[PDB]
Amino acid sequence: YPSILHPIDHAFNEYFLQHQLVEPLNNDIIFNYIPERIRNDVNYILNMD
Amino acid sequence: NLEELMRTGDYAQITNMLLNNQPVALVGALPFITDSSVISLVAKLDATV
Amino acid sequence: QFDFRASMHMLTSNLTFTVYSDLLAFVSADTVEPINAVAFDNMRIMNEL
């Protein structure tokens, strides 16, 4: 989008745009988020439905 | 073995085999429906369960 | 002084996404019957039955 900004304002907004904290989320990331020893415990059945 | 499957609750193998149409034999005391309809057999209903 | 050339920028971002917080809400977690729960050595936790 076009914007009008003072160079300092542009610096701040460009930093915000270029350094966002959101990462792509997929089922592999969620699966690895589970503790590794609970994923290996046969007493717990974990599924991605 | 259906008993082992029910005891462990891990359905990964049976799910993968059913989704991949891999011939298998599910072994265990099972109730069954008796169907005398020829049209049902032609409709291939036994494969839908 | 305000300069249009020095203030006009193009701000770039993503069109849309959804941010999620509770990753473990995406995991369907079940447990075996406690009678059948086993320990690290693959034997039942309580064997006196």
The string of DSSP letters for B2-27 reads HHHHHHH---HHHHHHHHTT------
C-alpha span between C44 and B5 (Å, rounded): 17
Chain C: nearest CA to A44, how far in angstroms? 5
Q: Choose from A20, A41, A49 for mutation: most chain C CBs within 10 A.
A: A41
Q: B28: which 2 tokens? A: 């265990």
Q: CA triplet B18, B20, B22: central angle to 5 degrees?
A: 75
Q: Choose from B4, B5, B6, B10 for mutation: most chain A CBs within 10 A.
A: B10
Half-sphere exposure of residue C37: CA atoms within 13 angstroms, side-chain side: 10
CB contact under 8 A, C24 and A48: no
Residues A47, C28 contacting (CB under 8 angstroms): yes
Experimental method: cryo-EM
C-alpha span between B31 and B29 (Å, rounded): 7
Residues C28, A46 contacting (CB under 8 angstroms): yes
Reduced to 3 states (helix: H, G, I; strand: E, B; else coil), residue B19 is helix
Chains that touch C (3 or more CB pairs under 8 A): A, B
Give resolution, Å, one decimal: 2.7
**Which of A41, B22, A12 is closest to C11 using CA atoms?**
A12
Strands (E) located in chain A? 2-4, 44-47
Tell whether C21 lies on the interface with A, counting CB pairs under 8 A. Answer: no
Which single residue is written with the structure tokens 């989704």? B19
Chain B: nearest CA to C32, how far in angstroms? 6
